Short mmCIF file of N, CA and C in Angstrom, two decimals:
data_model
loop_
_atom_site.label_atom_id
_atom_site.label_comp_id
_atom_site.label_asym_id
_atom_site.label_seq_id
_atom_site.Cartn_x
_atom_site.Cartn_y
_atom_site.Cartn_z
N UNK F 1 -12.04 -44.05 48.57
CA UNK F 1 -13.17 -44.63 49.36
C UNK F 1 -12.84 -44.73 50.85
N UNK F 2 -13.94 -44.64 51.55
CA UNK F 2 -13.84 -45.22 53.04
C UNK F 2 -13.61 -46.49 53.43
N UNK F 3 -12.47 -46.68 54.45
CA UNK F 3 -11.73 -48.17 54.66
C UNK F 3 -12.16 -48.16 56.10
N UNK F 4 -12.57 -49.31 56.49
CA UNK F 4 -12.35 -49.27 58.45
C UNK F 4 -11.60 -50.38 58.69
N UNK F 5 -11.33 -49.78 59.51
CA UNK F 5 -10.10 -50.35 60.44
C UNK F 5 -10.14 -50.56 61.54
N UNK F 6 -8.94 -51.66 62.10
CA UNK F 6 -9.17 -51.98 63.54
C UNK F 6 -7.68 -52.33 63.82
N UNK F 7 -7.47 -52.41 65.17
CA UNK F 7 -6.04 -52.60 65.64
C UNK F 7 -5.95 -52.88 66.87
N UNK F 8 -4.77 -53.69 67.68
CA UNK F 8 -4.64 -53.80 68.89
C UNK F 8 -3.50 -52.78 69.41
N UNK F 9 -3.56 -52.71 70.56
CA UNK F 9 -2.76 -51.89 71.59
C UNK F 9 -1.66 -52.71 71.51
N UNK F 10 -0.19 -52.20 71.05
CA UNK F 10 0.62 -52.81 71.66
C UNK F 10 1.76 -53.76 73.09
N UNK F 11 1.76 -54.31 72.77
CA UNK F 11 2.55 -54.85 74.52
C UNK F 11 3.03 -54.04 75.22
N UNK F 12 3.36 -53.34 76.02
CA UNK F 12 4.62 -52.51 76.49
C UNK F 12 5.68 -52.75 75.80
N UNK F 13 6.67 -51.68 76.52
CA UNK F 13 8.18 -51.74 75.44
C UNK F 13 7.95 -51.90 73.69
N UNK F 14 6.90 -51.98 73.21
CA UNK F 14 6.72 -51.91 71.90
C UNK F 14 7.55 -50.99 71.36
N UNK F 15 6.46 -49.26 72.00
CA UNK F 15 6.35 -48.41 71.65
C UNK F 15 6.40 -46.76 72.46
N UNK F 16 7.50 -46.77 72.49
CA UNK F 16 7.44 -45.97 73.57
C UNK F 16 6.44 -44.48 73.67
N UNK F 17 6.60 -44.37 72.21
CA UNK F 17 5.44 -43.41 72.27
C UNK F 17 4.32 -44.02 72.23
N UNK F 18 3.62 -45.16 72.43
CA UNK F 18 2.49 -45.96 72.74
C UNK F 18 1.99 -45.75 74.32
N UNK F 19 3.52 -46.28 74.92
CA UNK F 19 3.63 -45.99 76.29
C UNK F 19 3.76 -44.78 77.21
N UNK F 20 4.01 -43.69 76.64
CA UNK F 20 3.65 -42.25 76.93
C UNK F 20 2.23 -41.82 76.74
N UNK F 21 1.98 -42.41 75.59
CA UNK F 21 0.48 -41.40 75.34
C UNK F 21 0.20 -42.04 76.52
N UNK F 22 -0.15 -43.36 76.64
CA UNK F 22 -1.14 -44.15 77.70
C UNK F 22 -0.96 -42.95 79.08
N UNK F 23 0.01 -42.41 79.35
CA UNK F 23 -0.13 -41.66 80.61
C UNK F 23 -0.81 -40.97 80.67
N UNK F 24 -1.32 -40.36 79.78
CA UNK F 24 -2.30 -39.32 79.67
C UNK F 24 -4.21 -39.38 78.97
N UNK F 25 -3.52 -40.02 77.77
CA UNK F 25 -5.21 -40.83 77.10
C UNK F 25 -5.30 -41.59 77.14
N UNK F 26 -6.49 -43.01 76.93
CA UNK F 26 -7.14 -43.82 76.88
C UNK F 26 -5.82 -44.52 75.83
N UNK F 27 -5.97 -45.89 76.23
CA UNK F 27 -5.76 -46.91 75.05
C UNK F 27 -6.16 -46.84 73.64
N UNK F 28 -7.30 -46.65 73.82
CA UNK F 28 -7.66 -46.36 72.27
C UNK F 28 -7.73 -45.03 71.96
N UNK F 29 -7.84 -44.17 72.25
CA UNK F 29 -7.49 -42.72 71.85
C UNK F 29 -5.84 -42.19 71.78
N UNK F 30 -5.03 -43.29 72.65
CA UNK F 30 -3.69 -43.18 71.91
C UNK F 30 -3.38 -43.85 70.88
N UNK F 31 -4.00 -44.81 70.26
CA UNK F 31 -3.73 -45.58 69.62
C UNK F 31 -4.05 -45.47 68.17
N UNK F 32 -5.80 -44.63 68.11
CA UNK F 32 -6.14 -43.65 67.22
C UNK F 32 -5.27 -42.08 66.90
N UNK F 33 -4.77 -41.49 67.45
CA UNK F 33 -3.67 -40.91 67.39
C UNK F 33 -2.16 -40.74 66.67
N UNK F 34 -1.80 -42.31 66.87
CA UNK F 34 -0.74 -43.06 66.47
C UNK F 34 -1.03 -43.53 64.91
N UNK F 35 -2.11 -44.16 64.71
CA UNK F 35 -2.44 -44.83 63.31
C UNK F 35 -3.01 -43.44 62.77
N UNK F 36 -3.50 -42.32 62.85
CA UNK F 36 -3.59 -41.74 62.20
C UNK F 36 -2.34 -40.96 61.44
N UNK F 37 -1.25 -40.71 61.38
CA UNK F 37 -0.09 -40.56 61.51
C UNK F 37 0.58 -41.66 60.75
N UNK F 38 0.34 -42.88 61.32
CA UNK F 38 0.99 -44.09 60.88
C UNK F 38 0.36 -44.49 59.35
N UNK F 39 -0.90 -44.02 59.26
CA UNK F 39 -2.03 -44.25 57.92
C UNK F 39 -1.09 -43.42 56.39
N UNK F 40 -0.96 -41.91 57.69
CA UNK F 40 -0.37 -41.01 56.33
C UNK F 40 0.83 -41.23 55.93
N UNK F 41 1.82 -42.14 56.76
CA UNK F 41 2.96 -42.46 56.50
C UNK F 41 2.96 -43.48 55.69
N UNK F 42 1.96 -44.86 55.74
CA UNK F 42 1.82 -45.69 54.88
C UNK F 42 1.17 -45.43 53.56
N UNK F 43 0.47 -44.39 53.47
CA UNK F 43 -0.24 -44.46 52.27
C UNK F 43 0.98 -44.02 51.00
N UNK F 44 1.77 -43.62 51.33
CA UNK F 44 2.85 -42.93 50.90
C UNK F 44 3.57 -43.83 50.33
N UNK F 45 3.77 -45.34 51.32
CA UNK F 45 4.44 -46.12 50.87
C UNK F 45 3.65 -47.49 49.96
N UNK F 46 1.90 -47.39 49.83
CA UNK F 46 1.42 -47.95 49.08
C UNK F 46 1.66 -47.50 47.49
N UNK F 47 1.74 -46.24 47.34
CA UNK F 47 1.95 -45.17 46.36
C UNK F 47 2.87 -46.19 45.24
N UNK F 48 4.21 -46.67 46.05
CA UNK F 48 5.29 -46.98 45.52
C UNK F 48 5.70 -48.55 46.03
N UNK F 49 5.08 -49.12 46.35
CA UNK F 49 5.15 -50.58 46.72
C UNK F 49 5.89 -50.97 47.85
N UNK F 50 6.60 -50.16 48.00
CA UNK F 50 7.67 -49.98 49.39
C UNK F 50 6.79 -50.94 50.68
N UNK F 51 5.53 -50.64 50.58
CA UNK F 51 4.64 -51.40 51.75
C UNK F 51 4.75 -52.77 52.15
N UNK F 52 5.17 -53.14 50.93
CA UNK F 52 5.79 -54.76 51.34
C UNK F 52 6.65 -55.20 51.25
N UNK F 53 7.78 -54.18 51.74
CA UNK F 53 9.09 -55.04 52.65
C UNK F 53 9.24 -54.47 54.28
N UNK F 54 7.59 -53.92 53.93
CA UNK F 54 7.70 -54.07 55.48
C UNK F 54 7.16 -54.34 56.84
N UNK F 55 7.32 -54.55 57.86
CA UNK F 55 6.57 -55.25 59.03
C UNK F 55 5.11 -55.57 59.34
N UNK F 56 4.51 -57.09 59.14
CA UNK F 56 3.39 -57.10 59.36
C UNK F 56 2.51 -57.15 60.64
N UNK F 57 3.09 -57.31 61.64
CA UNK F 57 2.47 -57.24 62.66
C UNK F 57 3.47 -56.78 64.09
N UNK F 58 3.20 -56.89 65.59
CA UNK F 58 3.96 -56.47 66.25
C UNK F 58 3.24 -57.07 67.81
N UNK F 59 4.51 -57.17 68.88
CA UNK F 59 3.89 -58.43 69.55
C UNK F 59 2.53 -57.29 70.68
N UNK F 60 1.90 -57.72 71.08
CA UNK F 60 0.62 -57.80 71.90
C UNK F 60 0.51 -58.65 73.34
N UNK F 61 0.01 -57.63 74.50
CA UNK F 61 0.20 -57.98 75.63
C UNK F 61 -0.58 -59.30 75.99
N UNK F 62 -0.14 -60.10 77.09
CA UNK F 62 -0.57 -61.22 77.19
C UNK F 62 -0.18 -61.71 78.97
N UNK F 63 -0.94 -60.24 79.60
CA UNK F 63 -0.73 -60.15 80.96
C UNK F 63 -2.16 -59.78 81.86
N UNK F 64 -2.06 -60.04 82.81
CA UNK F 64 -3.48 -60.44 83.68
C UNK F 64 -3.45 -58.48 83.65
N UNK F 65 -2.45 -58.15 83.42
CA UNK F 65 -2.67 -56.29 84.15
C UNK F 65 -2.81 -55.73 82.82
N UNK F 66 -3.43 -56.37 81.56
CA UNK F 66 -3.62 -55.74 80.10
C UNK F 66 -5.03 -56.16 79.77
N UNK F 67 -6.21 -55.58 79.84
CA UNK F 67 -7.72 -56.60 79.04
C UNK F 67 -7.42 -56.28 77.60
N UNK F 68 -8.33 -57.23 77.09
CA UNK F 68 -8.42 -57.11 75.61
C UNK F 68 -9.58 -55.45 74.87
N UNK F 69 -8.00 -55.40 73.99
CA UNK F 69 -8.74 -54.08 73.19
C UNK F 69 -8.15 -54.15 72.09
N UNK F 70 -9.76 -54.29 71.26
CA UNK F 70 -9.41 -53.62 69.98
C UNK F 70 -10.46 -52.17 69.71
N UNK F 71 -9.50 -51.28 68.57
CA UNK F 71 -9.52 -50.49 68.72
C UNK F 71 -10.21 -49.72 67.21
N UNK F 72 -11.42 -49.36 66.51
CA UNK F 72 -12.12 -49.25 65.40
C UNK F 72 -12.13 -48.20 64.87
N UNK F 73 -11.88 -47.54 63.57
CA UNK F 73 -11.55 -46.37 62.93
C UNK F 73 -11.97 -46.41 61.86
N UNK F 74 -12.14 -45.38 61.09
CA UNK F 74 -12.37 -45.32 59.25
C UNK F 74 -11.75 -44.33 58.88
N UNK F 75 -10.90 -44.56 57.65
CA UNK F 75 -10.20 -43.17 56.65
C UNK F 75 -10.25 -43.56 55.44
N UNK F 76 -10.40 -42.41 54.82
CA UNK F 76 -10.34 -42.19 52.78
C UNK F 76 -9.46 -42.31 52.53
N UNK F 77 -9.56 -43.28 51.47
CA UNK F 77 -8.13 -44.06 50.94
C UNK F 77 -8.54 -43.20 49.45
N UNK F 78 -7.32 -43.23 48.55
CA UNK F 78 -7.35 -42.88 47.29
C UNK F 78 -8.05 -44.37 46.91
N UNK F 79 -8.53 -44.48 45.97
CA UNK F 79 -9.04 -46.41 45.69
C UNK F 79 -8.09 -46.80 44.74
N UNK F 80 -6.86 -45.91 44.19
CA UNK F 80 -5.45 -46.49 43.47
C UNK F 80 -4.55 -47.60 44.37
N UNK F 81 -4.67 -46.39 45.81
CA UNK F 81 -3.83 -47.01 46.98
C UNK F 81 -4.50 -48.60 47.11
N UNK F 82 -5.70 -48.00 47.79
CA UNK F 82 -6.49 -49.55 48.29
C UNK F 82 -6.25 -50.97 47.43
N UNK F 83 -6.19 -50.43 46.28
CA UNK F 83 -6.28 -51.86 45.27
C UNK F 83 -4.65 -52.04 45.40
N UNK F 84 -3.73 -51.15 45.48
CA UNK F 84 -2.63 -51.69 45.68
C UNK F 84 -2.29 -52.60 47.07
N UNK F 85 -3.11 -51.91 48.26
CA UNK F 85 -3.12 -52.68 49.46
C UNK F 85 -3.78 -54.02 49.40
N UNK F 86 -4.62 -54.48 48.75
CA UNK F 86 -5.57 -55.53 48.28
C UNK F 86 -4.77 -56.21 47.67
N UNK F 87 -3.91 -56.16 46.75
CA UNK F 87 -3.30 -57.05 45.69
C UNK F 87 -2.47 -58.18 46.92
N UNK F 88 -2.04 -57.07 47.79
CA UNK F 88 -1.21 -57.73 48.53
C UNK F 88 -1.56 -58.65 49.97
N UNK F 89 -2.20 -57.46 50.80
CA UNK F 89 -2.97 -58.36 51.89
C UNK F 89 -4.22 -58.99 51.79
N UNK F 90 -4.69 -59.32 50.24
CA UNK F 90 -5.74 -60.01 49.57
C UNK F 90 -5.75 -60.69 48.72
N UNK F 91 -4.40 -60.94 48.38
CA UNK F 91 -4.27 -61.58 47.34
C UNK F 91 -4.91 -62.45 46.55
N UNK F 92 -6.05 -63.29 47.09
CA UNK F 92 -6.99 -64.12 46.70
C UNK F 92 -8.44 -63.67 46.43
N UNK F 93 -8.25 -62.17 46.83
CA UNK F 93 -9.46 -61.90 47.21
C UNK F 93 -10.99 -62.55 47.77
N UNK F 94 -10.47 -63.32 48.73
CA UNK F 94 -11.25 -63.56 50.07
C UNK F 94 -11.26 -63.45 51.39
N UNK F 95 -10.57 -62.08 51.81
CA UNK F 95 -10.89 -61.56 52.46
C UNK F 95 -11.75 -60.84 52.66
N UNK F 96 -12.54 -60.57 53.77
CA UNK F 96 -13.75 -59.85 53.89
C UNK F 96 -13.25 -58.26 54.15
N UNK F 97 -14.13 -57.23 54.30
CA UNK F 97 -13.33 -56.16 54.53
C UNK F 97 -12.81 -55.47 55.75
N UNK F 98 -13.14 -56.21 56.85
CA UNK F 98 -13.21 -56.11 58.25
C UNK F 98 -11.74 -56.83 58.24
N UNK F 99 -12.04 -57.95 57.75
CA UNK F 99 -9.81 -58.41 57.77
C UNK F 99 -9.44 -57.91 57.29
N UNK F 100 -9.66 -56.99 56.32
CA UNK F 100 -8.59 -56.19 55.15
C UNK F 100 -8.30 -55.18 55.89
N UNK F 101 -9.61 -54.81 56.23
CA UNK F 101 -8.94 -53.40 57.31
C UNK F 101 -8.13 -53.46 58.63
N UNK F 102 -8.49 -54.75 58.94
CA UNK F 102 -7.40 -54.90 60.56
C UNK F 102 -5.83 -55.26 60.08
N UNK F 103 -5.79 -56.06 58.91
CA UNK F 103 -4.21 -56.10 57.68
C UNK F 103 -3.60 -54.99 57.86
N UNK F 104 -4.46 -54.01 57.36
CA UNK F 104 -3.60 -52.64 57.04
C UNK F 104 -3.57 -51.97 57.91
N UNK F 105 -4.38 -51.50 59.09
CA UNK F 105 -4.01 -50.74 60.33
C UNK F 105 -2.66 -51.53 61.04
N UNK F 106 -2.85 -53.20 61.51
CA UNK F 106 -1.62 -53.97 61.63
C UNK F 106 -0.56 -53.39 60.56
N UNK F 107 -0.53 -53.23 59.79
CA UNK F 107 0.75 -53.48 58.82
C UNK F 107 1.32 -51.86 58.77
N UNK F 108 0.53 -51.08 59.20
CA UNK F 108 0.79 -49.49 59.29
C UNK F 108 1.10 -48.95 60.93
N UNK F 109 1.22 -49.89 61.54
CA UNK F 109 1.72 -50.08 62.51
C UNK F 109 2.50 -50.39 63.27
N UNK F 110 2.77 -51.72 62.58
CA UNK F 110 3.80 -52.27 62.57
C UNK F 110 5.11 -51.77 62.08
N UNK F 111 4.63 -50.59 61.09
CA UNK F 111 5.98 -50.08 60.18
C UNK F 111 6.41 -48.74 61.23
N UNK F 112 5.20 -48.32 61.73
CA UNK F 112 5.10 -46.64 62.39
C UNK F 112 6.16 -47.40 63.58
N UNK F 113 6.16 -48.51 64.21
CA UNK F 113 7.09 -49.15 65.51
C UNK F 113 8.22 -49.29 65.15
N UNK F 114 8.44 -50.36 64.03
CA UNK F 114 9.73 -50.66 63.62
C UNK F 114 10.34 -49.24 63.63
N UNK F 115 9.85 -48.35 63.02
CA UNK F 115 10.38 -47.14 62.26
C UNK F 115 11.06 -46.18 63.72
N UNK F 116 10.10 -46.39 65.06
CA UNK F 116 10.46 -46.05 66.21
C UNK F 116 11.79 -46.69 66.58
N UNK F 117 11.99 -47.75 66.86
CA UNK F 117 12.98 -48.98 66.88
C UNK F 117 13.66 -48.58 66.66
N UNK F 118 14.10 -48.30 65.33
CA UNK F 118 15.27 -48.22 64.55
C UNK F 118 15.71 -46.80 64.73
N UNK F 119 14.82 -45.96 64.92
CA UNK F 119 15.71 -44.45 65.35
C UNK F 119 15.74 -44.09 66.55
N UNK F 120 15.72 -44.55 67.52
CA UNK F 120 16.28 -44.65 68.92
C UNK F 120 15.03 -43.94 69.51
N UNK F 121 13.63 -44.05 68.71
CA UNK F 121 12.48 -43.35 69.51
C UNK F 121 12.70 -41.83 69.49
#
């Protein structure tokens, strides 16, 4: 099924490939870029549960030279995956689907950075 999604721009120094694209595209067209990429890397790890040992969110600018952006998308999820993403960032199931989807773009994001982090970019 179709999931939408939403996400913020990271802080600087997040991401360095965050901070490159920006030289060239838009905030949100690097950022759509990035999570698309970051989507196919996570779905991989919904597959196998792996998705939750890892990073849920990542810090966000909070400077007069940054406005606020969020950033709106939709992709086809297998609906095996999704309910596995649900069990977890829904656990109660009361979340609406507009939080479910900003959960998982955050949380596929968060992993696509760390994952930068840790291999020297």
């Amino acid at each position: 099924i179709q999931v939408f999604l939403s996400a913020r721009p990271p802080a600087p120094e997040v991401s360095k490939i965050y901070d490159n694209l920006i030289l060239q595209y838009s905030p949100s067209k690097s950022l759509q870029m990035i999570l698309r990429r970051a989507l196919g890397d996570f779905e991989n790890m919904l597959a196998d549960g792996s998705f939750r040992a890892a990073p849920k969110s990542y810090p966000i600018p909070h400077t007069a030279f940054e406005k606020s952006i969020i950033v709106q998308t939709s992709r086809m999820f297998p609906v095996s995956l999704i309910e596995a993403a649900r069990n977890h960032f829904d656990p109660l199931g009361l979340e609406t689907a507009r939080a479910f989807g900003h959960k998982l773009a955050t949380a596929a994001l968060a992993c696509f950075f760390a994952r930068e982090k840790a291999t020297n970019s």
